[model samples]
Target: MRFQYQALLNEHQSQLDRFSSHIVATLDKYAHIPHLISKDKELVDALLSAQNSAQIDITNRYLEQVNEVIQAADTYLIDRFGNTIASSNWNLDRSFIGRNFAWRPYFYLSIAGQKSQYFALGSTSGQRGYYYAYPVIYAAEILGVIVVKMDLSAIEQGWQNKSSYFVATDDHQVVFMSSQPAWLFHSVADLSPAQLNDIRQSQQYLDSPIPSLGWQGDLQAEQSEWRKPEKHWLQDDYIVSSRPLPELALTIRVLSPKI
Candidate 1:
C-alpha cells in the first residue's frame, strides 16, 4: 500500500508540475504585453492627453483589439490615480472601465515599478482570476498601468478527474483552485487573526466564506494519510501528495482514495 501511494504521489507531482509550468509560461507571456502596449505612441499619447471621451473611445477600441490578440479574460489600462481609463470589457455589462483598483495588490505593487501577479476573486465579477499588472512607462515616466486578468477555469476543466482530485493553495493556506469544486475556497485550518486581517485587506476571496477542510491528519508528514469523510467527495480514506509552486506562490496537492 505504501509503495502504491508513493507511486501515485510521484505521478501526481509530475502532472502538477506540468500544469504549473503552463501557468508560469502564461504569466511570462503576459508580462511582455504591457511593455509592448506602453511603447504604442498612440495609446501613450492618449493617456497623457486630456480626458476627452473621444481619445478614450479610440483607446478602448485599441484595447479591445489587443485583448483579442492576448485572449485574456479582461485587459485594461489604469491611470496614475488607479482609475481604469480603458478596458477590453468596455462593451460588456461588467465592464472594468471607470472602476478603481488602487487597493488591489497587483495594482499597487506594479505601480511601485515592479511587475506583479495576484490571484483573487474579482470584486466586480465575483469570478476567480489571476491578475498580471505592470507599469506603463515612457522615458522613465510611469504614465499608467496595464492589467491582464487571466481566467483559470480552462486549466481546471482539464483537471477534472474521478479517482483523484487536486487542490492548489495560496500562501494564506486557502485553497484557491481545486479539481473538486466542493473544495474550492476552503482553508486547511482555522485562520489566524493576522490571516483574517490580511484576507480582509486584500479582499482576495471577497465575501466568500472560507470553511476549513476538516482534514484530520498530519499534513506536514512526508507521507500522510488523511480522513475527511464529511468534506471529501468520496467520503473515504485518502493519501495526499503536495508539491510547491514557488514562482506562483501556491502549493499543489493531490488526494487519491486509499485502495
Candidate 2:
C-alpha cells in the first residue's frame, strides 16, 4: 500500500502537475490574443474612454474567435468592477453578460495587477474548471480581466488516480479530487467564521453548508489531528503525501488507509 501510494505520487501527481503547468503556461501566451484584438485604436479608445457598446461588441467577437481557435477553452472579458463585458458564452442560453464577479479572488487579484489562476465549481455554468485570469491594461490603467476557462474534468478524466487524492484551495474549498464523494468540496482544515462569511458573500460554492472536513492527517507522513467532535465521530488513520501546486496556489494530497 505504501508502494502504491508512492507510485501514485510519482505517476498520477506527475501527470496532474504537468497538466496544470501546461495549462498555466499555455495561458501565459493567451495574453497576446486579447492584446491583438484590442490593439485596434477604435477599440482601445472606446475602452479607455469608457464607451461600452462598441467596445463590448469587439470584445465579444474577439473572445469568441479566440475560444474557437482553442476549441477546448471558453474565454470571457470583465470590467474592473467585475461586470461581464463579453464572453464565449454570449450566444448561449446562459450568458455571463451583466453578471458581477468582483467578489471572486481571480478578479480582485487581477485588479491588483497580478496574474491569477483559480480552479472552482462555477455557480453559473454548474461546471467545474480551471480559470486562468489576466489583466488587460491600457496606458496606466487596468481595463479589465480576461478569463480562460479550461474544462479540467475532461482533462483529468484521462489520468486515473491510483489513490484517494484531492487539491485544496486557500479559501477552504477542495477544488480537485480523485477521492470519495464526501471529501470533494470540504476544506482540509477548519474555516473561521469570517472565512465562512466571506465564502457566503462570494457565492463561490453556491452550495449550502459545504461538506465538513474531519481531517486527522499529514503532508507525506508528517501528521496531525483535529479535536474530537463526538464519540462516534468519523476519523480514520491514513498515510498521506502532499505537495504544493504553486501555479494555482493550491495543494495536492494523495493518501491511503493505514493498516
Candidate 3:
C-alpha cells in the first residue's frame, strides 16, 4: 500500500509541477509586448491629458483591439478593475460590464507596481482559476493591469487524466480526491477554517516533492516545504501540499488521514 501510494503521489506531483511550469512559461512569454499600452510617450500623455474629452468609443475600439491581441493568445484580458475587457473563446455575462473592480487586491497590487500571480477561488468567471496580473506602463506611469485567467478545473482535470492519483486523507477523512467524490463538489471557500487548516497540515503533502524538468537531481528537495500548521478547532486533521507560489505568497495544500 505504501509503495503504491508513494508512486501515485509521485506521478501526480510530477504532472502538476509540469503544468505549473507551463503556466510560468506562458506568463513569461506574454510579459512583454512592444506596444501593449503604446510606445509613444507623447501619444499616451495626450490621451490621458484629455481624460474628460476622451471618447468612450475610441477607448472601446482600442480596448477591443487589445482584447483581440490578448484573446488570440488564449488568454482573457481585463483592465485593472474587475471588468472583463475581452476573453478568449469565453463570453461573460453582461452584468459584469462597467463594474468597478478597484477593490480587488489584484488591481491594487498591480497598481502598486508589483508584478504578481495567484489562484483565485471563484471571483474570476465564477470558477476556481489562476490569475496572472502584470502592469501596463507607459513612460513609467501605471496605466492598468493586464490579467490572464487560466482555468483551474481544466488544469486539475488535465493532471488527473494524465496520472493515476488519490488525494491524501487525514484521520480517515479524504480532504481531497482527484477522482470525483460521492458528494457534490464544494468550493474551496465553503470549507470551514478548521477543515482548511487540516488540509494544510497533512503529511501527504509534506512528503511530496516538487519535480524539476530535464534534471538528474533528486526531486524530493524541489518540492516545497509545509509551514507550521494552523489551529482550527472545528477540523480534525490538516494536510497541505508543500508547493509554494512565492510571487503570490500562497501555498497549495491537501488534507489526508493521519497514517
Candidate 4:
C-alpha cells in the first residue's frame, strides 16, 4: 500500500509533466505561423490597398488556403483600426469579417508591436481556443495584425483516465484547461475586485463569473514542490500535485482520489 501511494504520485507527476511539455512545444511551433503569415507581401499589400475589393478577395482566398495548410481553427487579419478585413471563414454564415476586436488583448498587444498569445472563449463562435497574433509592419510602421486560432479542446478529448484528472491554470489560478469539463473557468479562490477587473478588461473568459472552486487544504501550500503529492479537500478528499510551466505563466495540476 505504501508503494501504491508512491507509484500513484510518480505516475501523475510524469503524466502532468508530459502534458505540459507537449502543449508548450506545440504552441511554440504554432506561434511562428502568425509571424510567417505576417510576412506575406501580397497579403500585406492587399490590406494596405483596401480600396480594391478584388485584391482583397485574392488574399481572403489565400487565407482560406493557408488556414487548411496550417491546420488552424481559423486565420484572419485585423486592420490597424481593429476591424477584421479578411478571414479564412469569409464564406461561413457566422464569419468574422467586418468584426471589430480591438478589445481583445492579443490584438491590442500585437498592434503595439509585440507578438501575443491568449486563451479565451471565442466571443463570436463561442469556441474555446488559443490565439496567437503578430503585427504586420512595413518601414517600421504597423499596418495590421494577423491572428491564428488553435483548437485546444482536442487535447481534452484524449484524456481517458478515470482515476485521476488534470488541469491547467493561468497566472490568476483560473482553470483554462481541464480533463473535467465542470472545472473549466473556475478559479482556485474568490477573485478580488482588482483581479476581476483585470480579467474583465482582457475579456479572457467571455463573461464567466469565475466562482471559487471551494478548495480547503494544503493544495495551495504544496504547489511549490513539483514532485510532492499532498492531500486536499475539494468536494471529496484528493491527493493533489502541481507543477509550474513558466514558459506560459501557467500551472499543471493533477488530482487523484485519496483511496
Better of 3 and 4 by lDDT: 4
Candidate 1 stretches greater than 4 Å from native: 25-29, 218-223, 228-235
Residue pairs clashing in model 4 are none
lDDT (C-alpha, whole model) for all candidates: 0.79, 0.62, 0.42, 0.81
Tens-place lDDT digits, model 2, residues 150-206: 776544443355544445444364444544556666766566778777666766666
Q: Give the per-residue lDDT digits (tens) of candidate 3, residues 31-66.
A: 443235433333244335424334433444454455
lDDT of 4 by residue, 1-259 (tens): 7568878778887877777767776787678988898979766887788668887798889999999998888899999999998888999875898899999889989999999988889988888888999999987789999999999856676566787888888887889989888988987656788998788777888887888775555445433222222454334556778887775667778888665
Best by TM-score: 1
Tens digit of lDDT per residue, candidate 1, span 124-169? 7778888878888888888888888888876676665677887888
Q: Can you give the lDDT of residue 36 in candidate 3?
A: 51
In angstroms, the error of model 1 at 21 is 3.3
Backbone Cα, N, C clashes tallied per candidate: 0, 0, 20, 0
Q: Give the distance in Å from residue 248's predicted Cα in candidate 2 to where it truly belongs.
A: 1.4
Which stretches of candidate 4 lie above 4 Å from their native place? 218-235
Q: What is the TM-score of each candidate against the true structure?
A: 0.89, 0.72, 0.50, 0.88
Candidate 2, pairs of clashing residues: none
Report the lDDT of model 1 for residue 142: 83
Ordering by lDDT:
4, 1, 2, 3
Error of 1 at 215 (Å): 1.1
In model 2, what is the error at residue 18, expressed in angstroms?
A: 6.7
